[PDB]
Amino acid sequence: GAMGSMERASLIQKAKLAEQAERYEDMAAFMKGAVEKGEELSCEERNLLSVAYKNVVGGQRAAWRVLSSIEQKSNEEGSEEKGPEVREYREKVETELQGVCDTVLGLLDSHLIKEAGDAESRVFYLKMKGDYYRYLAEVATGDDKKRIIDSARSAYQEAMDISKKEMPPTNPIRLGLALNFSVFHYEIANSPEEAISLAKTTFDEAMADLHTLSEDSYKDSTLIMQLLRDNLTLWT
């Protein structure tokens, strides 16, 4: 670990500076170093970890989609042969993306999830496990595609089970988990009806619980509810 000589608190401080500078690769490396100190992460620290890697992998995924679309067009009839370069470069980006997902999944397995006992931390990390297996599924084409998809499903399902038992229906982690598991159903698992049902039930149960919230909590929950509503409008 190249961050092994830096203090935990300094890694966290630098992760926050990296966020301000929009240096998300640095942010992710600082937060990886902080995780590898072996202590559990606070709520704020968990969100720094997720923001960092979401931005890194988000850029890789967008690049992969651009290259995959060019590669698909090259394989249409009447397309001029251009050589192996598009496939090679798409593969290079794909391998880098898979490496980042494997890094995140490795941090969760060694040893964030096994030490996470509170609902807020455990659900958060299981959502992350589902998300990063989902990103692996987006690029999978081979013999393990079904197992990758089932790994994402299983992680999301455990997170859902805990969130429904331990969290109110307006909790932003619960809402964001449902948002993403719904998208998993729609576009990974070929289950658009399940995706729509999950988004609708999640939205409706949150609606009914808004009356219990402070103004600030209401703002937090309604923001994610609007994402669920947007997806429902797109899909129906």
């Binding site: 998300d131 964001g176 948002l179 993403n180 998208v183 729609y186 576009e187 994610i224 994402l227 947007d230 997806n231 797109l234 899909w235």
Partner: peptide, 6 residues
């Protein structure tokens, strides 16, 4: 637009 994840 495109679907949201978070």
């Amino acid at each position: 637009n495109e679907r949201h994840t978070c």
